[PDB]
């Protein structure tokens, strides 16, 4: 019943003391933190506490949208040699640093996921040519579904896939995705392997990655310019912003101290130094 | 009155009994006691096998040594108990398995000895690689060092042999072996054996995972990391030595999907 | 007019949205439907119907009528498999083309129990006892009856009742398995071995066929709708 926006426990006025009770003495061998408050050690007056923990609630701590990835696509001229650039990105929070570390404060989580799409385009070649306002399809390809090989192949029919046709210039795109995990919680860290190396099998056949569950965990997004070739080249950058809503978490873990290296927990050399120089007897 | 103390503890599981006269109470991880799967959270349809007394008993892992040189030590559960009586037998015989533990670490000395050992319990204790070229490259055979377990190192030394990698964990002590400052290791359930005070660490651990029951062969639930917070010191000596012994007891263990035995390639 | 503020997402078209929109033919007299026999309400309903499995997909037997026939014989008893099959209904060539798999090919995740049914198609006089077994994953796929017999199985006797059914009980680490080949969501192994042997008297065909069927169970479900690969339009 104690909500987030509740006033914190008050400070009780306590006077001088000379008794056989020892708030001050403990033993951190027990693993337990000694739970004291100012009054326990020094004389205090009465204080009606006003501050609340309101903002520090798990839900509020993740209430911000965050850039997960930057997908780049383009629409070149018809005569061109290179193909029209259409991107495919494996949906994961671990491509960027910020949001990841925040999510790493715990062992597991559940959250309905909100994605936002900020598209931004421009020309590239020195020319005064023209491009009419461009549209963009963002097709979510769940694991196993046919990944588009061309920018104009059958896959874009999306008879079952959930897509979003964004018209450039209008407000950023947004879609809601519930907790879609195969487990009873999303796993930030997975101490194990997908395969088991059997003895009646060759090492190769039984080998897999350390820390990985399913290579394809959530699927890929596919983004393409819908409008056809235009004599003047136009490149586009779609920025995805994720805001984890309705979030729950379990078992806290120490926050990442050294820079990330790969999708794993691994650390690169040359970054193994986080704390600076400070003399013990210097304030 | 009758003389009941926090230091004096007698734990009993099956046909094994652990006593102690210098304890510092006991730790129930996240306040939850280990338990059997409730119909509400059940997942596999078959009748689960609960070995009970057959597997729910203390198993002593070979004793390691502590010297001024020691950086650290680590194990994985259920991994560590992979070859402990029926628990292992049952473990290898089923596709799924969930178990909790009563971890008791033993390390005594004299009132003239000094130091501190932090036995940490980390659910999903992922450790870091040894290559500056290949992420997440530690091979299964090095990921699961059984009852002998592993250690922590004082320096990160990359593996350069790209002709045949060493594929092991290089878990830097101060980084708790996972890129985070050791000083924060207390967020995990823990006890610190500080020689002058106690002589043992008892950490009861419930089953913790993202799934109700999971493949034990493939995945380790908990992690037991022991690193000397205070280095070992004895008298005016240059080479002191005292042993550390780990006895872990699986609790409320249940296994589903009975099939032929898995003979893993451990070497 | 009522003061409003346009929010993120406006003007965007979700192919999976569910909004109201204007009608092209206002007041259109819709013809009433009639009671057309056999109405379906859910895809799973079709999934529970037994469908014949093209087991033997040899280069010489694939894409023909021969694929569904698994031929047994009166050869002496051995411990070698008649047929092996991996539980990955939507990704294993054999299962992936049965009703179940097809429906499964439209979803990302599947869960529940499955049941295989085997139909003997020999002469009345032919007898025998076979063993069909489902071994959960995480170990060596059996190659001898000795191992297979250690898992989940049914010992079938060929007789007056010609069909036998072995249920594959939903035993998995995750609450839902991927509809693609994946280690993390592996399914195990389905195997069939001769329990005794096939015995036939004189003047009797010494070899015959068995037909396999598969179907989901009342507890089975599928989620996260997706596009299938079992069809395409090249240009």
């Amino acid at each position, epitope marked *: 019943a104690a909500t987030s926006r509740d006033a914190l426990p008050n400070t009780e006025a306590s006077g001088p003391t000379h008794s056989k009770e020892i708030p001050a003495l403990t033993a951190v061998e027990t693993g337990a933190t000694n739970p004291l408050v100012p009054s326990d050690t020094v004389q205090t007056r009465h204080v009606v506490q006003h501050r609340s923990r309101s903002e520090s609630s798990i839900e509020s701590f993740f209430a911000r949208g965050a850039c997960v990835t930057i997908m780049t696509v383009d629409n070149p001229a018809s005569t061109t040699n290179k*193909d029209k*650039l*259409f*991107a*495919v*990105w*494996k949906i994961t929070y671990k491509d960027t640093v910020q949001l990841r570390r925040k999510l790493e404060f715990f062992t597991y989580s559940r959250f309905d996921m909100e994605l936002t799409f900020v598209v931004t385009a421009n020309f590239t070649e020195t020319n005064n040519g023209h491009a009419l306002n461009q549209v963009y399809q963002i097709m979510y390809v769940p694991p196993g579904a046919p*990944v588009p090989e061309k*920018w104009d192949d059958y896959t874009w029919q999306t008879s079952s896939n959930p897509s979003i046709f964004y018209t450039y210039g209008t407000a950023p795109a947004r879609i809601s995705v519930p907790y879609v995990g195969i487990s009873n919680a999303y796993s930030h860290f997975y101490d194990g392997f*997908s*395969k088991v190396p059997l003895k009646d099998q*060759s*090492a*190769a*056949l039984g*080998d*897999s*990655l350390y820390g*990985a569950a*399913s*290579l*394809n965990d959530f699927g*890929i997004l596919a983004v393409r310019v819908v409008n056809d070739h235009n004599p003047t080249k136009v490149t586009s950058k779609i920025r995805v912003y994720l805001k984890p809503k309705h979030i729950r978490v379990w078992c806290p873990r120490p926050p990442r101290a050294v820079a990330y290296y*790969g*999708p*794993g927990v691994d650390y690169k050399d040359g970054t193994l130094t986080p704390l600076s120089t400070k003399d013990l007897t210097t304030y | 009155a009758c003389g009941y103390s926090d230091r004096v503890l007698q734990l009993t599981l099956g046909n094994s009994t652990i006593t102690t006269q210098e304890a510092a109470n006991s730790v129930v991880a996240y306040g939850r006691w280990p338990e059997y799967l409730r119909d509400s959270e059940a997942n596999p349809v078959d009748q689960p096998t609960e070995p009970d007394v057959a597997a729910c008993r203390f198993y002593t892992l070979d004793t390691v040594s502590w010297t001024k040189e020691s950086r650290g030590w680590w194990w994985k559960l259920p991994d560590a108990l992979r070859d402990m009586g029926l628990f292992g037998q049952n473990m290898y015989y089923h596709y799924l398995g969930r178990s909790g533990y009563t971890v008791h670490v033993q390390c005594n000395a004299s009132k003239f000895h000094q130091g501190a050992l932090g036995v940490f319990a980390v659910p999903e204790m992922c450790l870091a690689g040894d*290559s500056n*070229t*290949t*992420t*997440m*490259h530690t091979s299964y055979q090095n990921a699961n060092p059984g009852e002998k377990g592993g250690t922590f190192t004082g320096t990160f030394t990359p593996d350069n042999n*790209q*002709t*045949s*990698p060493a*594929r092991r964990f290089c878990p830097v002590d101060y980084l708790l072996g996972n890129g985070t400052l050791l000083g924060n290791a207390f967020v995990f359930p823990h006890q610190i054996i500080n020689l002058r005070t106690n002589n043992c660490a008892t950490l009861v651990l419930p089953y913790v995972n993202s799934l109700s029951i999971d493949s034990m062969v493939k995945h380790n639930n908990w992690g037991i990391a022991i690193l000397p917070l205070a280095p070992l010191n004895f008298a005016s000596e240059s080479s002191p030595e005292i042993p550390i012994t780990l006895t872990i007891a699986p609790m409320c263990c249940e296994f589903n999907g009975l099939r032929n035995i898995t003979l893993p390639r451990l070497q | 007019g009522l003061p409003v503020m346009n929010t993120p997402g406006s003007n965007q078209y979700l192919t999976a949205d569910n909004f109201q929109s204007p009608c092209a033919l206002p007041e259109f007299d819709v013809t009433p439907p009639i009671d057309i026999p056999g109405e379906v309400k859910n895809m799973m309903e079709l999934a529970e119907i037994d469908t014949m499995i093209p087991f033997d997909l040899s*280069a010489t037997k694939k894409n023909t009528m021969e694929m569904y026939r698994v031929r047994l014989s009166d050869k002496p008893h051995t411990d070698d498999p008649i047929l092996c099959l991996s539980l990955s209904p939507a990704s294993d060539p054999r299962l992936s083309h049965t009703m179940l798999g097809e429906i499964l090919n439209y979803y990302t995740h599947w869960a529940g129990s499955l049941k295989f049914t085997f139909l003997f198609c020999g002469s009345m006089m032919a007898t025998g006892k076979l063993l069909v077994s489902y071994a959960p994953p995480g170990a060596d796929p059996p190659k001898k009856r000795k191992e297979a017999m250690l898992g989940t199985h049914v010992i079938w006797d060929i007789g007056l009742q010609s069909s036998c059914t072995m249920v594959v009980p939903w035993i998995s680490n995750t609450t839902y398995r991927q509809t693609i*080949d*994946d*280690s993390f969501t592996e399914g195990g192994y389905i195997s069939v071995f001769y329990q005794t042997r096939i015995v036939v008297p004189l003047s009797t065909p010494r070899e015959m066929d068995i037909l396999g069927f598969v179907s989901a169970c009342n507890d089975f479900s599928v989620r996260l709708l997706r596009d299938t690969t079992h069809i395409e339009q090249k240009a």
Partner: nanobody, 120 residues
Framework: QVQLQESGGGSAQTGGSLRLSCAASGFTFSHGYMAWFRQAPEKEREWVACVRTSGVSAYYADSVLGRFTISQDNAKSTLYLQMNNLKPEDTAMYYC?????????????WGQGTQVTVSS
């Protein structure tokens, strides 16, 4: 648009050697593996060999052991399959399956493939 395009041909005499290459693009998130697969004329698609992300740690198929060599050049973002001692069993199509992996089986990107023929 992770474009995987094989090259290397396939029309050698029995016993020779060929260099099977594969141009990779798009976003190959290094970490994982990169490999080779063969379908054969009339058999099931079979795994040939897999090499680690950037690491030169690899394995080979029992059938091809030592007679095939799979490397990489992540500077040139390519993978190579040198094949010495080609034989009548090696006659087949080869595919550069280099994406995700994590092992020697999982994929989200394949190529168009190329045929090899060891004649004699």
């Amino acid at each position: 648009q992770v474009q995987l395009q094989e090259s290397g041909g396939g029309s050698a005499q029995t016993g020779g050697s060929l260099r099977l290459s594969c141009a990779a693009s798009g976003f190959t998130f290094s970490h994982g593996y990169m490999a080779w697969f063969r379908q054969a004329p009339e058999k099931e698609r079979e795994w040939v060999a897999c090499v680690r992300t950037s690491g030169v740690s690899a394995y080979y198929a029992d059938s091809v052991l030592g007679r095939f060599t799979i490397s990489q050049d992540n500077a040139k973002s390519t993978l190579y399959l040198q094949m010495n001692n080609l034989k009548p069993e090696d006659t087949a199509m080869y595919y550069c399956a280099a994406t995700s992996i994590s092992c020697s089986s999982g994929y989200m990107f394949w190529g168009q493939g190329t045929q090899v023929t060891v004649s004699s």
